[PDB]
């Protein structure tokens, strides 16, 4: 479990969120620089 | 490491051909160099204790810990750890019709720590509730304890004890060596560097283990560094580093 | 039960938790297991407060134990002045004998404690105390080494 | 929400697992006989094989041994369990057997018996506990050093918010039967000293005289008094020693005895005497915390006082994460060269918390710890979401 | 020991009870209420633990017929299954892994050919890993397999 | 038969005194219990080689051996290397109730132990008992009868 | 050779640590050659002999 | 002063049953002399550190 909850659970986040937040990350870093 | 393993291996055969009284002393195999790495001396600013006292603290409270510190081949003591000395008088031994052999005998038989078993000990019987140890006969501690030691019982009713024939004085293991720091009563350790060990790391180590045990010295017990070959290595090496940086700026 | 809790606390020195155990009604004749009840222990380490607290509550001051050693003995040997006087105030036997024959005056001679010997003598003294070995007070004072201790016993 | 949840999650090395086995202790009062400590063990093993005979396979009951110390007053029992297919539900997992099996052994009177799962990994270096050593730096002695411990072990309890489960490893002093004999009587009776110190430690202690051969194997020949002749102190007046007048003297004509206090298990450390102490950190607190106070509390100890912390505690000194910094310095230098920018590296590096927050939510639902399977379980979600990102960045770029 | 002036002789049996005995009587172990000695077997360097357990397993069965009456052996503490199960589970996860990659791949894609390329690339890499562990000295253990299902 | 002072002062202190010039030693535990046994664990810096570690230690123990009592020297000062890493234990029990652990151990020792030690793939092996020993239990009453002492 | 020279007889406990035990003779009685006829040793018949 | 067997059972079987673990051990042989002496020889995997 220790390698199953911090990964399966950890994943649901790093994909639902990442596909929305990283188009952002790239746009706000091309801004300040 | 292996060179020592063999030379020990070949010694361990020769051991039982050596006189009883050369084995009891303990033969040592070491792998040090022949030159002192450093002599760590020890004085007494208060003079509360003599040059004999000084040597017996060093001997009984600092030397083993340093001799077990990794990198230390050999530790040579400038003085001697105490030992219960006994000085016999000829006129008094003949007076009572005794011989020094006999003196040796009474010591081996009254100064002995023996194992005596315990109560309720295994295997128990049917219905045992008690279970303790048994003790008797522990080593002697004080010269005074030794002074008591009974030598013989005269038919007269006279008590010939050890004192009456000898002068018991806690005393040095040997009187050959006497150290003196700046013309002042002293002692110390000649430390030799085991083979291949890094001098600097080894030194850092004594310094560290010597520090662990300053917080417990008696009155005015000071440490001094009369002879140390290490500082010249550290200072030399940084002097080249300096001319490096220096050459870059130039 | 608590008796053992008490035994484990007389020995250690936790006098605070001795008031609490006195508070709830522990046993003062708990003795274990060699027969050393708490008064015996308290004296031998030794603790004044707990000797006293215990004394107030219920303590055989004179408790033989398996070998007859009694708190007074234990004090003399271990040699506690403050506790030799107390056990003497609350009534003890200065001529108490071991299955051995050791009264508190020999045990004080052996230890070389001239300050306990005097009190004991004042309280009681058989200077003709015949040991299992017939050795006496001034006899063991010579053999021992001490000199002035033999003076007082002449 | 990540920084807040991270520090509020207790962290630990590795979860105990249900290995099919658990171990139990049994300690008895000082002076306890081998027979008494065996009637307790009898009770323990019946319980496992009766009140819970659907989950236990066998019980191995070793009387007379202990990790703290040996002697007729200790015992360990080890329990072996059935297949997990014969056990279902977490109500039959080792934690459930154990807590329920320790919570039945309390009615017992005069024993300190308590079952507990065994550490995964057999590391005495059980986690989050410390390992204290209190040394004798000057020639103080035992009764002296034993005092200075009860003293440090007093404070240690004065901070329950900091330190819990703090205890001495070793064994307490017990009563002894010391015995001295007088020479003057001794020489006057004809009897030799060698004749005495040996007819005692032989009959009572056991003496191994020689060797013999049995069934083609060499073995030891030992000598000792019969069980029923060396049990109690009275029995000492039964032995006689021959004099030189060719007469026999009873042992109880040159000897005296009484009771003294001594210690089994005298510990020692780096040459000079020691008392070892082990404890752990209070709930909520860490260990960098629970060791600093112990170090100070100790400094007030009466001079010849020293602290040696060893083992679980010692490695802890190591190490500072000068790697977590290097590690992070590099990840940057790497992106710097892929994208050809000192700046863009940051848009990829930001995704770390997106991976970690889902790690922490996931964990806390169930109740899990910051063990090693987690810390790598993060490292792999961190690495993978940073990979996704490098792609979207590089496709965008 | 001594000869009687009376001339009768004093023999050792007469004053001691000579019977064979153990060197030490300090500790007594049991198992379900019956006596047992046990043996602690350490796993020798660079060795396989599944084999060494099957080995002794046979080697114990192999001396079975010489055992005295009632003497039978048992396994109070064996760690092997814990190493057997662990391994079954590594390979299971890798098996249902590819299956999932087949369907989550057929569903989005259309053709059969695409699904397959994964089934090849995966078990190739995972095989190489063992080779290189082997180079550094590493064993196949609890840590290094979970380190793979990850 | 010794107390813990006898053991510590003599066997234990002396050994400690002569363990000089060993290499890579972090620390030295020791504890002298009353069951007669001393136990002097020496802990080495990690990465040290156990084989060499142990032989330098064994070497200084040897030179230190003429210094210890007769009866300790006769007995034996073993020097093992500590692990607590058993691949299993084997329970050798007796359902027939016809033999004691004293026997079970002798049996395991003489028969099972050789095979276990030689067992393919096994390292060191402990025995959870002794071998038989000759025991002469005296009677204090008898000897005196004959003006005899142990 | 015990009288001059000396002899390491035992071991004893001096303030914790364990230490040695010698036996020798007082210097006065071992400084001159005429001092050999100063020492007497026991004989079975019981008489000392210079 | 001993026959070859007394030795085997007090010396050689002692040593040999103690030799359970050794890196790279191929085989091991052992002769008892009756001159009261003996020898045991262990041969190691060929690539081995003497």
The helicity of chain A comes to over 70%
Fraction of residues in helix of chain C:
40-55%
Order of helices and strands of chain C: HHHHHHHHHH
Q: Please compute the radius of gyration of chain A using only Cα atoms.
A: 14 Å
> What is the oligomeric state here?
part of a larger assembly
Helix/strand/pairing category of chain A:
mainly alpha
Rg estimate of chain C, integer Å: 16 Å
| N-end to C-end Cα span of chain C | 51 Å
Architecture of chain C in CATH? Alpha Horseshoe
What composes the largest sheet of chain A? none
- How many domain modules of chain C? 1
**What is the approximate shape of chain C?**
elongated
Our estimate of the beta-strand percent of chain A is: under 5%
Q: How many E-type strands of chain C?
A: 0
CATH superfamily of chain C: Ankyrin repeat-containing domain
Number-wise, the strands of chain A total 0
PDB class: transport protein/protein binding
Keywords: membrane protein, RND, drug-efflux pump, transport protein, designed ankyrin repeat protein, crystallization chaperone, TRANSPORT PROTEIN-PROTEIN BINDING complex
Entry title: Designed ankyrin repeat protein (DARPin) Binders to AcrB: Plasticity of the Interface
Chains A and 6 copies: Acriflavine resistance protein B
């Amino acid at each position: 479990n220790a390698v199953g909850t911090g990964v399966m659970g950890g994943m649901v986040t790093a994909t639902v969120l990442a596909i929305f937040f990283v188009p952002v990350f790239f746009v706000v870093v091309r801004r300040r620089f | 490491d292996i060179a020592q393993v063999q030379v020990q291996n070949k010694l361990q055969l020769a051991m039982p051909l050596l006189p009883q009284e050369v084995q009891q002393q303990g033969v040592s195999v070491e792998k040090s160099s022949s030159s002192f790495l450093m002599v760590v001396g020890v004085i007494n600013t208060d003079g509360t204790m003599t040059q004999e006292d000084i040597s017996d603290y060093v001997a009984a409270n600092m030397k083993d810990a340093i001799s077990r510190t990794s990198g230390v081949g050999d530790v040579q003591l400038f003085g001697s750890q105490y030992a219960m000395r006994i000085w016999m008088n000829p006129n008094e031994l003949n007076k009572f019709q005794l011989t020094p052999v006999d003196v040796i005998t009474a010591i081996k038989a009254q100064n002995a720590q023996v194992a005596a078993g315990q109560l309720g000990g295994t295997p128990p019987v049917k219905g045992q509730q008690l279970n303790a140890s048994i003790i008797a006969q522990t080593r002697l501690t004080s010269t005074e304890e030794f002074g008591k030691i009974l030598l013989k019982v005269n038919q007269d009713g006279s008590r010939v004890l050890l004192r009456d024939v000898a002068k018991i004085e806690l005393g040095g293991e040997n009187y050959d060596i006497i150290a003196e720091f700046n013309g002042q009563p002293a002692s110390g350790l000649g430390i030799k560097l085991a083979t291949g060990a890094n001098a600097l790391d080894t030194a850092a180590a004594i310094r560290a283990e010597l520090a662990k045990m300053e917080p417990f010295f008696p009155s005015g017990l000071k440490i001094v560094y009369p002879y140390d070959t290490t500082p010249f290595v550290k200072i030399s090496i940084h002097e080249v580093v300096k001319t490096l940086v220096e050459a870059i700026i130039l | 039960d608590l008796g053992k809790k008490l035994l484990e606390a007389a020995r250690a020195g936790q006098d605070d938790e001795v008031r609490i155990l006195m508070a709830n009604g522990a046993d003062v004749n708990a003795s274990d297991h060699v027969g050393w009840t708490p008064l015996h222990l308290a004296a031998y380490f030794g603790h004044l407060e707990i000797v006293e607290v215990l004394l107030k509550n219920g303590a055989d001051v004179n408790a033989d134990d398996s070998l007859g050693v009694t708190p007074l003995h234990l004090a003399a040997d271990r040699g506690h002045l403050e506790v030799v006087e107390v056990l003497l105030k609350n009534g003890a036997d200065v001529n108490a004998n071991d299955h051995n024959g050791f009264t508190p005056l020999h045990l004080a001679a052996n230890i070389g404690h001239l300050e306990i010997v005097e009190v004991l003598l004042k309280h009681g003294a058989d200077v003709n105390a015949q040991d299992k070995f017939g050795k006496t007070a001034f006899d063991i004072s010579i053999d021992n080494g001490n000199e002035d201790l033999a003076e007082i016993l002449q | 929400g990540m920084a807040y949840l991270f520090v509020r999650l207790p962290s630990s090395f590795l979860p105990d697992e249900d290995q099919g086995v658990f171990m139990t202790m049994v300690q008895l009062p000082a002076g306890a006989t081998q027979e008494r400590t065996q009637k307790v063990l009898n009770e323990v093993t019946h319980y496992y094989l009766t009140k819970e005979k659907n989950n236990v396979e066998s019980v191995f009951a070793v009387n007379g041994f202990g990790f703290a110390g040996r002697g007729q007053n200790t015992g360990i029992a080890f329990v072996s369990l059935k297949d997990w297919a014969d056990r279902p539900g977490e109500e039959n997992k080792v934690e459930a057997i154990t807590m329920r099996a320790t919570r039945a052994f309390s009615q017992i009177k005069d024993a300190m018996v308590f079952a507990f799962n065994l550490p995964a990994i057999v590391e005495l270096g059980t986690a989050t506990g410390f390992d204290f050593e209190l040394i004798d730096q000057a020639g103080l002695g035992h009764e002296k050093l034993t005092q200075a411990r009860n003293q440090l072990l007093a404070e240690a309890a004065k901070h329950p918010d900091m330190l819990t489960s703090v205890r001495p490893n070793g064994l307490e002093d017990t009563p002894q039967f010391k015995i001295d004999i007088d020479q003057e009587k001794a020489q006057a009776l004809g009897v030799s000293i060698n004749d005495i110190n040996t007819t005692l430690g032989a009959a009572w202690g056991g003496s191994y005289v020689n060797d013999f051969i049995d069934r083609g194997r060499v073995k030891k020949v030992y000598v000792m008094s019969e069980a029923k002749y060396r049990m109690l102190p009275d029995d000492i007046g039964d032995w006689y020693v021959r004099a030189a007048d060719g007469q026999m003297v009873p042992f109880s004509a040159f000897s005296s005895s009484r009771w003294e206090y001594g210690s089994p298990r005298l510990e020692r450390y780096n040459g000079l005497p020691s008392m070892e102490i082990l404890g752990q950190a209070a709930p909520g607190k860490s260990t960098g915390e629970a060791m600093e106070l112990m170090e100070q509390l100790a400094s007030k100890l009466p001079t010849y006082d020293w602290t040696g912390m060893s083992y679980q505690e010692r490695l802890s000194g190591n190490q500072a994460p000068s790697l977590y910094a290097i590690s992070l310095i590099v990840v940057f230098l790497c992106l710097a060269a892929l994208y050809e920018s000192w700046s863009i590296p940051f848009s990829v590096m930001l995704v770390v918390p997106l991976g970690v927050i889902g790690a922490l939510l996931a964990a806390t639902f169930r109740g899990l710890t910051n063990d090693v399977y987690f810390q790598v379980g993060l490292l792999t979600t961190i690495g993978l979401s940073a990979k996704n990102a490098i792609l979207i960045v590089e496709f965008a770029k | 020991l001594k000869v009687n002036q009376d001339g009768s002789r004093v023999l050792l049996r007469d004053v001691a009870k000579i019977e064979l005995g153990g060197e030490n009587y300090d500790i007594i172990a049991e198992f379900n209420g019956q006596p047992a000695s046990g043996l602690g077997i350490k796993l020798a360097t660079g060795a396989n633990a599944l084999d060494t357990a099957a080995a002794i397993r046979a080697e114990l069965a192999k001396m079975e017929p010489f055992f005295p009456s009632g003497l039978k052996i048992v396994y109070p503490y064996d760690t092997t299954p814990f190493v057997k199960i662990s391994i079954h589970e590594v390979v299971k996860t890798l098996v249902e892994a590819i299956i999932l990659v087949f369907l989550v791949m057929y569903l989005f894609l259309q053709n059969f050919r695409a699904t397959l390329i994964p089934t090849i690339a995966v078990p190739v890499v995972l095989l190489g890993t063992f080779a290189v562990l082997a180079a550094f000295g590493f064993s196949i253990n609890t840590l290094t397999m979970f380190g793979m299902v990850l | 038969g010794a107390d813990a002072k006898t053991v510590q002062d003599t066997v234990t202190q002396v050994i400690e005194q002569n363990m000089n010039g060993i290499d890579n030693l972090m620390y030295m535990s020791s504890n002298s219990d009353s069951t007669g046994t001393v136990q002097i664990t020496l802990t080495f810096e990690s990465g040290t080689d156990a084989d060499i570690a142990q032989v330098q230690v064994q070497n200084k123990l040897q030179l230190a051996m003429p210094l210890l009592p007769q009866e300790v020297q006769q007995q034996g000062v073993s020097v093992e290397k500590s692990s607590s890493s058993f691949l299993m234990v084997v329970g050798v029990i007796n359902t027939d109730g016809t033999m004691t652990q004293e026997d079970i151990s002798d049996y395991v020792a003489a028969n099972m132990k050789d095979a276990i030690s030689r067992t393919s793939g096994v390292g060191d092996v402990q025995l959870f008992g002794s071998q038989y020993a000759m025991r002469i239990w005296m009677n204090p009453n008898e000897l005196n009868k004959f003006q005899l002492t142990p």
